[PDB]
Amino acid sequence: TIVKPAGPPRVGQPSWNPQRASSMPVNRYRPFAEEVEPIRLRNRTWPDRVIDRAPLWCAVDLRDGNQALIDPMSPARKRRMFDLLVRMGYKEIEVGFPSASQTDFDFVREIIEQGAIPDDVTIQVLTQCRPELIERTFQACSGAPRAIVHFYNSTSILQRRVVFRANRAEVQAIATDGARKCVEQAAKYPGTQWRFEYSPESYTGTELEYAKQVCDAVGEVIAPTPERPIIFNLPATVEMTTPNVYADSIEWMSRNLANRESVILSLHPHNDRGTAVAAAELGFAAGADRIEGCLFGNGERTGNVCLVTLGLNLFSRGVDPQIDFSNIDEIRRTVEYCNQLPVHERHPYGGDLVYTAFSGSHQDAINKGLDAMKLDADAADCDVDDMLWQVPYLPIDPRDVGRTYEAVIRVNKGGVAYIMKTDHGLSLPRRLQIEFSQVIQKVSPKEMWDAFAEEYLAPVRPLERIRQHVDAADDDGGTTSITATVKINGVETEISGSGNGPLAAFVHALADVGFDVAVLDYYEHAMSAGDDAQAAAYVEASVTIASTSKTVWGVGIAPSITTASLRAVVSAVNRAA
Amino acid sequence: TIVKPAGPPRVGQPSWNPQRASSMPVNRYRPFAEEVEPIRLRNRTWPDRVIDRAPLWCAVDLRDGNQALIDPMSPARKRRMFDLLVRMGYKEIEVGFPSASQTDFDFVREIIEQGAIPDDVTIQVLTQCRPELIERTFQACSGAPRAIVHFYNSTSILQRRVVFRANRAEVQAIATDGARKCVEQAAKYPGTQWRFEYSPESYTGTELEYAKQVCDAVGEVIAPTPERPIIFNLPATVEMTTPNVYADSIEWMSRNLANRESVILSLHPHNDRGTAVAAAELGFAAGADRIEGCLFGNGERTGNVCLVTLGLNLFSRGVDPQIDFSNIDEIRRTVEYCNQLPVHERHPYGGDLVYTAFSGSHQDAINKGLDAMKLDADAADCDVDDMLWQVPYLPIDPRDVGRTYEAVIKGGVAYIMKTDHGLSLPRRLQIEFSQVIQKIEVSPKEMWDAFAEEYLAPVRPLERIRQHVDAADDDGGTTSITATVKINGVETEISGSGNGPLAAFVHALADVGFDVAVLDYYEHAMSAGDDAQAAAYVEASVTISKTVWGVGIAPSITTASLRAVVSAVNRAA
Ligand SMILES: CC(C)C(=O)C(=O)O
Ligand SMILES: CC(C)C(=O)C(=O)O
Ligand SMILES: [Cl-]
Ligand SMILES: [Zn+2]
Ligand SMILES: [Zn+2]
């Protein structure tokens, strides 16, 4: 059960703080400086540096992400993730651990043999240091034009004592023997341009002076140069303390590593304290060159640092991340298919709720921000979508990541979608729900329905549809023509058009009477099932009217699927007025 | 869709970095120093401080959390969250926005009238500065033994310009008139120990000198003392930049605010950049006294800072958070029930997978760690459960929060069919098809071949060659159809009437021995444009009774629907 803390307050605790000591066993845990070492970088510069360039990114979704899954990726899921990363713009991708996993070996073989690797992309493979594993790693990459061989071994104080029971020389030799084998194997495969990355695994549990010693010894074996640099990757394998301390450690390593001009300094933070993004950002300001992570923070336990958050955290402060996030929903859907794990509702940039506003005062402030941008754009003769984003409560324009701001209205088990379906049998398409909620913004079930009817169902001006004759060709792929009687602002008139179906025909007919309806989307569903059966149709259109253009939804309801579609078009035109 | 970045690399971009410029509109966004101001702090000290005591916590789950939910808390869920917060050890709890919401007003009344507030807990209520709203707030707290009245107004450069259209003096007067009204109402409600909190809302988009001026001016009205302090709560209403810059802001405020001994400096970070936890911790090292957050990071958009993460981040480094997390599963189950939102699988400390090791190598190292602990413990006559935790890959003993270490040893139909073929299958069709596919992993290319072979290709027993639709002109009139079909290869005419073309065609099929009833029907466009293709999905009961899906694809809404009926009839057989 949960036990209310009841111990004494600390000595010195202010009288305005009535908190009590808990009975958690805090004595089983020590401050970082005692667990590992004191890191004091008094002359640090990272606090005074603002990031002004994207780092070199490396995506490790196919390895660190993959092996953290409940269900590891099938061959199809691996290819889909790899193609997604390539398409987004990543140029270094860790594709697996091929010497430890036959499925990973076969994946690396498949991408090499089927020419799936672009010429500006370098695949990365992880291996432990045992000589036969290193050999198998090189075998896996046979025929690659280029590849990064990432070898690692654990250097932490704790692992040296309880896992390896070894001294400093012994654990360093594991790494330098690995490096020696890498040099020897690279000489055997002259057809591939080999590059190396070494990680002192569990770096954040390792003395910095020892980390430097091991990395330097590995570097002497590899003998990197400015034109062929080595990657030293410094993982927060477990995130052990606050991100400022990790940043201090990176700045120290960046200053003190030998042959620094021949080093690409790489960060690999995990999220055990929930501050992986902060560790990466402050560490990059501290002199790192490269960051390893996963899309949406997948990876061992709490995950690797989120590459989406890091990239969009640049974008939103005016630095190009050099990765495309223009359609974050596509990225999300692909990630969820590949990982079989959802992106949380509140995940930065991608989560369901992150461009939502529930508060009336927030919604009002957002509309004022939006209105003022449009006014300044009209004045300067510019597209508002190209102007400086100046909107309270929305860090970015959701349209810049392919999303839409959502002003959610509460209905007095609730919510517009749910009640529309239960009370009126309509399944509103998601973008319709958002549009309609914005109409309501500018509520009881009755009020909701009444607003829906006056907006989408009732209007009869400027366009009313009386009747029509549909002449559909009998044969597949044939033309449908329509003649319709309509009232335009009260006045009966006859219109004509043709199209691949009655919807298209009707749309084309209305163009001659001054309504340009460019159909963007369309959905239909049944309501009920017999002689009482009806169809509900929803049409999204960019509409322009004679005597500017607006994207709007129309709704139509009718016993015929054809007539419901036509009613929806009329509904859209009248919304646009 | 996603387009690979293809613009020129930056000048001076290193040879070893081949990344290209994206086409994202970065020029719509400015560095923080330009959007707001540069950092004013000389000789910061927060980078040299390690937290060594717990802050004063305030939980805003019942307000910031609650108002951010799609399903807001019932009165029962509210009491449950309140009691949870009390039992865990929280002493300040923001219980609502009662002047804006009758449900919050009724809840405040309820916990006061029922005598539900322990002697060491102070409730906190949120209000805007309008005088009528302050009155209503005090009415809600009538009879409270003590209460924090938290009043706020927005101070940021942006909101001053485009929300309020007001200058600095006017915006300061709103806060300061608010404070005066609070002082007035406090004198009219005797006995209650009134306490105040002021937030310059959107603080992170506000000039620091100005934020200081407003707070100082509010404080002059309230006249707090060291025994009766005021809370100045400085929110990252939007998280706008890196946590070090927030922390520099906090340290600056802590050093420059007037009457500092009579101020509890409070942080209220949101998570827009994923760094609220970091902002809080560095902010606390910067000299803040107090932190407002929600359990498991609930709240507007990306949420308020996570109280669980902050508290257990102290525990795991040897500092008592003064809050009990001994049973994090109870905490989580209650939070999930109250918020009706899940804790993510990877959420620090509480998520499903955070104490799981799938890697054989990690499992081995974990076991070596636990064994050496058991050796040191047998040798010292101690329980291992009281010994220093020393286990690779596990920052804490999962038992210390009621959990356990777990050494652990789905075709994607919807996604593949929508992504590769433009088809959004109705949920029940997804199920039907993905069981037919388990029976054959199947590649995407293999999956499509099977979809086509079941839904699109068959032409027996029913093939539809062509048809004439005679649609009623007027609404509500009849539609007739005449179609040329083949039954088991045999050309035959069928004909029928109904309320639309789809009904007419199903009734027509009755004459030929197929009794079809439309149970469900869905249709969607397959591209943009006033001409593109339609996908239709029909679920029908079909005798010569099996209930089956059909799929039709065609340039016309009408024809796609008819093909979907044919598809269904052929699956039935
Ligand atoms: C293999 C190494 C880089 C690792 O994943 C880690 O230390 O987290
Ligand atoms: C009311 C204020 C403190 C708020 O919730 C915020 O600024 O985030
Ligand atoms: Cl019909
Ligand atoms: Zn890792
Ligand atoms: Zn807030």
Buried b (16+ CB within 10 A) or exposed e, A23-59: ebbbebbbebeebbbebebeebebbeebbeebbbbbb
CB B502 within 8 A of CB B562: yes
Q: How far is residue A303's CA from residue A133's CA, in Å, rounded to a whole number?
A: 26
Closest by CA position to B253, among listed B229, B238, B232 = B232
Count CB-CB contacts under 10 A for residue A140. Answer: 25
Residues in chain B: 573
In total, the C-beta contacts within 8 angstroms joining chain A to chain B are 509
Contact in structure between A317 and B32 (CB atoms under 8 Å): yes
Q: B246 to chain A, minimum CA–CA distance in Å?
A: 11
A482 part of contact set with chain B, CB < 8 Å = no
Chain A contact present for B397, CB below 8 A: yes
- Which residue in A478, A509, A546, A514 sits closest to B530, CA to CA? A509
Pocket test for ligand 2, best of B201, B298, B300, B301 (most atoms within 8 A of CB): B201
Sign of the four-CA dihedral B369, B374, B379, B385? positive
Q: E-assigned strands of A328-475?
A: 356-357, 406-407, 463-472
* Whole-angstrom distance, CA of residue B431 vs CA of residue B46: 56
- Distance between CA atoms of B362 and B377, rounded to whole angstroms? 23
Distance separating alpha carbons of residues A327 and B1, to the nearest angstrom: 6
Token couple for A235: 């993982």
Contact B38, B45 (CB under 8 A): no
Instruction: Kindly give, in sequence order, each residue whose CB lies less than 8 Å from that of residue A446, ignoring residues fewer than 6 positions away.
Output: none
Nearest CA to ligand 1 atom 6: A237
Q: A89: phi > 0 → left, psi -120 to 50 → alpha, else beta; which?
A: left
The C-alpha of B188 sits at a distance from chain A's nearest C-alpha, in angstroms, of: 24
A30 interaction partners in chain B (CB closer than 8 Å): 317-318, 388
Say whether residue B281 is in contact with chain A using an 8 A CB cutoff: yes
Structure tokens at B465: 């060659």
What is the C-alpha to C-alpha distance for residues B170 and B315, in angstroms, rounded to an integer?
A: 45
Q: Which residues contact A383 (CB under 8 A, 6 or more apart)?
A: A377
Residue B213: Cβ within 10 Å count: 17
The Cα A510–Cα A517 span in angstroms is 8
Contacts of B28 (CB under 8 A, 6+ apart): A318, A386, A387, A388, A389, A397, A400
Rounded distance, CA A261 to CA A402, Å?
40
Strands (DSSP E) contained in B162-213 are 193-201
Query: Please, where are the H alpha helices in A394-429?
Result: 416-424
Residue with tokens 């240091």: A129
Structural domains present in chain B? 32-408 (3.20.20.70), 409-572 (3.30.160.270)
From the CA of B152, give the closest atom in ligand 2: 1
Instruction: Please give the structure tokens belonging to residue B8.
Output: 């020129």
Closest-CA distance of chain A to residue B387, Å: 6
Of ligand 1's listed atoms, the one at least distance from the Cα of A203 is: 7
Which one of B346, B438, B539 would you mutate to disrupt binding with A, by most A Cβ within 10 Å of its Cβ? Answer: B346
Q: Are strands A406-407 and A122-127 parallel, antiparallel or unpaired?
A: unpaired
Q: Do B475 and A273 touch (CB under 8 A)?
A: no
Residue A90 contacts residue A81 (beta carbons within 8 Å)? no
Ligand 2 neighbourhood includes B64 CB (under 6 angstroms):
yes
Residue of B nearest to A153 (CA): B361
* Annotated binding residue A304: yes
Residues paired with residue B266 on neighbouring β-strands, in sequence order: B233, B290
Cβ distance B307 to B347 under 8 Å? no
Beta strands in B347-428 (DSSP E): 356-357, 406-407
Please tell me if residue A157 touches chain B, with a CB cutoff of 8 Å: no
H-state helical runs in B7-130: 32-35, 66-67, 75-88, 102-113
Place of tokens 């300094």: A265
Phi and psi dihedrals of A450, rounded to 5?
Answer: -60, -40
The verdict on whether residue B397 carries a ligand-binding annotation is: no
Rounded alpha-carbon distances, angstroms, from residue B117 to B64, B92, B121, B146, B572: 20, 11, 6, 10, 65
Q: Is B195 in the pocket of ligand 2 (CB under 6 A)?
A: no
Distance A345 CA to ligand 2 centre (A): 20
Element (H, E) at A314: helix A307-315
Say whether B554 and A476 touch across the interface (CB within 8 A).
yes
The strand order across the sheet containing A480-488 reads: A463-472, A480-488, A491-499
Residues of B in contact with A346 (CB under 8 A): 271, 297-298, 301-303
Cα gap B339→B84, rounded to integer Å: 13
**B64 labelled binding-site residue:** yes
Alpha-carbon distance B449 to B10, whole Å?
A: 46
Cα separation, B146 vs B428, whole angstroms: 56
Please tell me if residue A45 touches chain B, with a CB cutoff of 8 Å: no
Give the sign of the dihedral formed by CA A132, CA A137, CA A143, CA A149.
negative
A237 in contact with ligand 1, CB cutoff 6 A: yes
Ligand 1: which of A104, A126, A174, A215 to mutate, judged by most atoms within 8 Å of the beta carbon?
A126
**Of the residues B58, B66, B152, which should be mutated to test ligand 2's pocket, given the most ligand atoms within 8 Å of the CB?**
B152
Characterise A280 by phi-psi region: left (phi > 0), alpha (psi -120 to 50), beta (else): alpha
Interface test with chain A among B34, B56, B320, by most A beta carbons within 10 Å: B320
Alpha carbon distance B68, B62 (integer Å) = 10
| Ligand 1 in reach of A63 Cβ (< 6 A) | no
- The answer to whether A75 contacts chain B (CB < 8 Å) is yes
Distance between CA atoms of B283 and B81, rounded to whole angstroms? 27
The H-assigned helical ranges of A425-518 are 430-441, 445-452, 502-510
Task: Indicate the residue of B4, B346, B369 with minimum beta-carbon distance to A89.
Answer: B4
Output the CA A294–ligand 4 centroid distance in Å. 10
* Pair B292, B267: CB distance under 8 Å: yes
The alpha carbon torsion through B315, B245, A282, A45 (nearest 10 deg) reads -120
Beta-carbon neighbour count of residue A265 at 10 Å?
23
Ligand 2 atom showing the smallest separation from residue B201 Cα: 7
User: Between residues 415 and 454 of chain A, which touch chain B (CB distance below 8 Å)?
Assistant: 415
Please name the residue ranges forming H helices in B485-572: 501-509, 557-572
Supply the residue whose CA is at minimum distance from atom 6 of ligand 2. Answer: B237
CB contact under 8 A, A76 and B443: yes
| Token output for B510 | 């009755």
Q: Is B172 close to ligand 2, i.e. is its CB under 6 Å away?
A: no
> CA-CA distance, B490 to B466, in Å (whole number)?
14
Binary contact (A4, B89; C-beta < 8 A): yes
* B514 within ligand 2 shell (Cβ under 6 A): no
Ligand 5 centroid to residue B97 C-alpha, Å: 12
Contact B287, B267 (CB under 8 A): no
Resolution in A for the shown PDB structure? 2.0
- Residue A465: both structure tokens together: 């549809």
Q: Å from B434 to nearest chain A CA?
A: 15
Radius of gyration of chain A (CA): 31
Which two tokens mark A158? 């704790």
Of A10, A156, A519, the CB nearest to B529: A519
> What's phi and psi for A493, nearest 5 deg?
-160, 160
The C-alpha of A110 sits at a distance from chain B's nearest C-alpha, in angstroms, of: 14
Interatomic CA distance for residues B91 and B332, integer angstroms: 20
- Closest ligand by atom to B504 CA: 3
Helix (H) or strand (E) holding A285: helix A276-285
Query: Could you tell me which residues come within 8 angstroms of residue B307 by beta carbon, excluding any fewer than 6 positions away?
Result: B57, B59, B291, B293, B294, B295, B323
| Residue among B336, B141, B565, B409 at smallest CA distance from A526 | B565
Q: How far apart are CA B558 and CA A568, in angstroms?
A: 15
- Classify B138 as helix, strand or coil: helix
| B361 with A128: Cβ contact below 8 A | yes
**Residue of chain B nearest A45, judged by CA positions:** B47
